[PDB]
Design a protein around this nucleic acid. Structure first.
Ligand SMILES: [Mg+2]
Ligand SMILES: [Mg+2]
Ligand SMILES: [Mg+2]
Ligand SMILES: [Mg+2]
Ligand SMILES: [Mg+2]
Ligand SMILES: [Mg+2]
Ligand SMILES: [Mg+2]
Ligand SMILES: [Mg+2]
Ligand SMILES: [Mg+2]
Ligand SMILES: [Mg+2]
Ligand SMILES: [Mg+2]
Ligand SMILES: [Mg+2]
Ligand SMILES: [Mg+2]
Ligand SMILES: [Mg+2]
Ligand SMILES: [Mg+2]
Ligand SMILES: [Mg+2]
Length: 66
RNA sequence: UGCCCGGUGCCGGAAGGUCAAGGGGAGGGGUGCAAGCCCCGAACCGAAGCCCCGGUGAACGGCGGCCGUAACUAUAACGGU
């Protein structure tokens, strides 16, 4: 349970970031897939289904052998 | 060579409370014609000891429980009771 958490949380530094929420520019970027939206008020309210599907896509595009 | 004198010890305290023999004798009782003889007896006075108020540990001795809380987990300097 510990080695697995540190595989996810790490040190918690500013880097190691997975997804930035920039309020001044109403932007929400997810750096693993190259996806950004601008519905920040909607993202921080629950409408995350866009980014998840966008993540699932690159995951299925990842599972391409060989 | 720390903290606890509530308990036991010892030390201190001419106040107060309790307190024995004794002092005292309100008031009774036995008997006798009686003078009387005999008995009981309340208040009150009346030590040490004990109570009571203090002190005291290189005197007898005693020196907690539960619950929470910090940049991963853990722990908990910290908080509550
Ligand atoms: Mg000692
Ligand atoms: Mg003591
Ligand atoms: Mg003592
Ligand atoms: Mg004492
Ligand atoms: Mg004394
Ligand atoms: Mg006598
Ligand atoms: Mg007497
Ligand atoms: Mg007498
Ligand atoms: Mg007498
Ligand atoms: Mg007569
Ligand atoms: Mg006395
Ligand atoms: Mg005593
Ligand atoms: Mg005492
Ligand atoms: Mg003791
Ligand atoms: Mg003992
Ligand atoms: Mg923690």
């Amino acid at each position: 349970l510990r080695k697995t958490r540190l595989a996810q949380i790490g040190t918690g530094e500013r880097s190691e970031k997975i997804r930035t929420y920039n309020f001044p520019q109403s932007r929400v970027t997810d750096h693993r897939i190259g996806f950004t939206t601008h519905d920040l008020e909607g993202v921080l309210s629950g409408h995350l289904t866009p980014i998840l599907e966008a993540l699932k896509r690159a995951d299925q595009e990842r599972q391409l052998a060989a």
